[PDB]
Specification:
part of a larger assembly, 4 chains, mainly alpha, elongated, binds 1,2-diacyl-glycerol-3-SN-phosphate, binds sodium ion, Transient receptor potential cation channel subfamily V member 1 (chain D), membrane protein, TRPV1 in nanodisc bound with empty vanilloid binding pocket at 25C, Transient receptor potential cation channel subfamily V member 1
């Protein structure tokens, strides 16, 4: 079950013995044998060398170029290309999987990919390999995007072939040139809407464990595409949403600040404009709360994220949902003849007012600032509050034990009195009902010194990690957030209208190997080159 | 009178070190006040509105008084027990503690972000700007 | 009881980030308290003796009370007008202002010197020390 | 209006064909022709290669040294 399924052809391929390989091939044995041994499984045990489970993929991934040439160019029985293993991976998929984001590995992988692609196209120009997908419905480009293989994606997106009868296999072209300025083109097919899974959709919605999510959207066409879509319509849509939200919040706060104080609601309205205005404000606030509730529930139902990805991601949907829940609980208590609805409503109001930082994205500097705040809150509060709480509780218990009897003889009062020392208004002489003044003074001084040292070390440790590697990360995270906003806004079609569209129709290659021409939704980019003429 | 007295920083140019210091002050005022005051004002207004809504009736039942009372927490003289005409003491204490923690985190991040951009590329620019000002 | 409660930092080792934080606290306590407390104590004692000599007679005429009154200036709650039984108000005010300025300069220099040694050679050492502690 | 005003002399200059340039010059055509096409405007559209609008400036700004020598040192 471990070494089972192996065949002499695999050994011959992986020993680099061209003569022995040829002699073994001449025997007439099948060249499509598959090894099912657990040693060849994906991740069933740390030992393992996944290679696509076929000898051709062994040649492809094991530095074998002349060998694969011989296998595919032998008149005896050439090895088929479209063969898919148990998992469904093809030779191209295996090549993508073998990549590990290393310069030598990346150059090797791209070279082998190009060679196999050109050979297959030459031998069988009718068939196209890039459209063949495994069980999971992932194309080689989509698979590379999902696994965060930067090199393969970068090479594929701007693949250029400079050989006759092979131009149509490339994606980047050169429509025209003049002097030092020449205009290129890029194929957007299977980038914005492939009808199964686009590169943008897969990269944007991928969970955080993927290696290089932040640094992947710097590839050439994608950045310009996102910027273009934004400047085209997302700016206007986002600003309108911002305005509507601000208006709603102003209405809510104005309506709530004037709540009547009589006791035991509900309250009977009076025949005056004020009461009608207040009722309208309450109705508007409740409608907004329930609308946000449905939007949040819909998003959570559709995405269905994990548990540890519900704080690293979706950090704002949770907050909006919580605000909606508070509003709903408040109204339920209001109609049940209670008096806690005030507390619920004020909690909701404060949270909603402070939850408007989400709209800074779209303003570069402010977006970066908000991202920094979010990262600090998520990555330092838990690590830096436990120690302070431990110190505070220890010294509070000690001091409360010392005192004999009085107003500060409980635990909450003394906890507050010791907390006051951190907002810089401690007293040091707040009680006199005890004995052994030396003990009291010593304890208070020790607490003050320890907490000041703790805060100083907090600050220095926080600054240390910023060795100037804090802007290059914040900017990338902000760009990713804007990208997800653009994708979401495009997905949620505005009203009944639909005008968003990638770019203009165009003819670039002239004609395919077949007589008919073709169109590929190009996206022209103009560049100026001065050196390397 | 106050504006005129404070408007004598313009005459530091001509004294190298003082000129550089004044240029730094000008750049900071022009490039960080707008970016760093909006967030603080938003937080302050939100929590002030919440607290004012909670209270029932008294001297601190307006908006200006409570805004001032919450602003006092930043010059390090907040009270934490400035009123007793209300219900649900837990809500009051929770709101005040949350505001204090959030504002201290905000100021800390303000400081760290301000320092970050100074990766030692702050004197070579200040000196050049001062030289340009002396040239004009 | 207080010592035991505060002596639970030893169990952070085993949690990487918390272990590093505790190691940093230990190193700072061991390597800066002695070097940075002697100067402050000298300044405090000198100015406390001067002020106590100046005063004539009253509640703050001892040494412990005046030492505490001058220490209050560092937790940010000093008074500057805490007594009126003396002569030569100019001397009193001058002494208090000089003490405040000197101590603030001292704390600023403390902070800058503490930060200076961290030229980013502070994590590679803390991580190694934590690994050694886990090994033991 | 975009490619208007272009003349064969400009192409000859910007193709780096010394022999063809000389032969075209020998024909006797004017060497002070100016192209008014919008492609040659300052910033009327992101495409554009401003060069002073004269062939001599084309030679000057397009790595042409021997060509400009020939243009300025020809007795014709
Ligand atoms: C990580 C760092 C942790 C440090 C935390 C330590 C906090 C506790 C600080 C106490 C250190 C011990 C200093 C010596 C205490 C002497 C107190 C004293 O005068 O006697 C009290 C008191 C006698 O003082 P009296 O009745 O006022 O004269 O009781 C004792 O006799 C102390 C017995 C020991
Ligand atoms: C960016 C970060 C934003 C964070 C800002 C959040 C600010 C709001 C903090 C509130 C978080 C909620 C904590 C739980 C509140 C419990 C309060 C409580 O005890 O009940 C109040 C009050 C009951 O307390 P009681 O009448 O005193 O016993 O009303 C409720 O029943 C709360 C209903 C929920
Ligand atoms: C490392 C840096 C160390 C610095 C520490 C220095 C601390 C001492 C600061 C005093 C510096 C001397 C400033 C001049 C004092 C004038 C005080 C005065 O007005 O006269 C007091 C007092 C007269 O003032 P009056 O009786 O109020 O008018 O006595 C004197 O005549 C001063 C005699 C000198
Ligand atoms: Na204070």
């Amino acid at each position: 079950s471990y070494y089972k399924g192996q065949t002499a052809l695999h050994i011959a391929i992986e020993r680099r013995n061209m003569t022995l390989v040829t002699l073994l091939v001449e025997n007439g044995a099948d060249v499509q044998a598959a090894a099912n041994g657990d040693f060849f499984k994906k991740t069933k045990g740390r030992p393992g060398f996944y290679f696509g489970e076929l000898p051709l993929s062994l040649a492809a991934c094991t530095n074998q170029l002349a060998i694969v040439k011989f296998l595919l160019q032998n008149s005896w029985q050439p090895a088929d290309i479209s063969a898919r293993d148990s998992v469904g991976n093809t030779v191209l998929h295996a090549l993508v999987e073998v990549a590990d984001n290393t310069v030598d590995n990346t150059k090797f992988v791209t070279s082998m990919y190009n060679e196999i692609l050109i050979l297959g196209a030459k031998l069988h120009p009718t068939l196209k390999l890039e459209e063949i997908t495994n069980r999971k419905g992932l194309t080689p480009l989509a698979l590379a995007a999902s696994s965060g293989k930067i090199g393969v994606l970068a090479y594929i997106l701007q693949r250029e072939i400079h050989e006759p009868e092979c131009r149509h296999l490339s994606r980047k072209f050169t429509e025209w040139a003049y002097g030092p300025v020449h205009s290129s083109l890029y194929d957007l097919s299977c980038i914005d809407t492939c009808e199964k899974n686009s590169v943008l959709e897969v990269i944007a919605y991928s969970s955080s464990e993927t290696p290089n999510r932040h640094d992947m959207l710097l590839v050439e066409p994608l950045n310009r595409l996102l910027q273009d879509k934004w400047d085209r319509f997302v700016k206007r849509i986002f600003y309108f949403n911002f305005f509507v939200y601000c208006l709603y919040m102003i209405i809510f706060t104005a309506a709530a600040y004037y709540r009547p104080v009589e006791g035991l609601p509900p309250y009977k309205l009076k025949n005056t404009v004020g009461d009608y205005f207040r009722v309208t404000g309450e109705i508007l606030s409740v409608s907004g709360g329930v609308y946000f509730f449905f939007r949040g529930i819909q998003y959570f139902l559709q995405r269905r994220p994990s548990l540890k990805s519900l704080f690293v991601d979706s950090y704002s949907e949770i907050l909006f949902f919580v605000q909606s829940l508070f509003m709903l609980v408040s109204v339920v208590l209001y109609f049940s003849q209670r008096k806690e609805y005030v507390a619920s409503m004020v909690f909701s109001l404060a949270m909603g007012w402070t939850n408007m930082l989400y709209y800074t994205r779209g303003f570069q500097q402010m977006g970066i600032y908000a991202v920094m705040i979010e990262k600090m809150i998520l990555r330092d509060l838990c690590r830096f509050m436990f120690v302070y709480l431990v110190f505070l509780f220890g010294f509070s218990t000690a001091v409360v034990t010392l005192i004999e009897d009085g107003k500060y003889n409980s635990l909450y009062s003394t906890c507050l009195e010791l907390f006051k020392f951190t907002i810089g208004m401690g007293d040091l002489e707040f009680t006199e009902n005890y004995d052994f003044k030396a003990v009291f003074i010593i304890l208070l001084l020790a607490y003050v010194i320890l907490t000041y040292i703790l805060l100083l070390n907090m600050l220095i440790a926080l600054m240390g990690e910023t060795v100037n590697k804090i802007a290059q990360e914040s900017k990338n995270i902000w760009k990713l957030q804007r990208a997800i906003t653009i994708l979401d806004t495009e997905k949620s079609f505005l009203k009944c209208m639909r005008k968003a569209f990638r770019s203009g129709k165009l003819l670039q290659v002239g004609f395919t190997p077949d007589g008919k021409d073709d169109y590929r939704w190009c996206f022209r980019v103009d560049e100026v080159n001065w050196t390397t003429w």
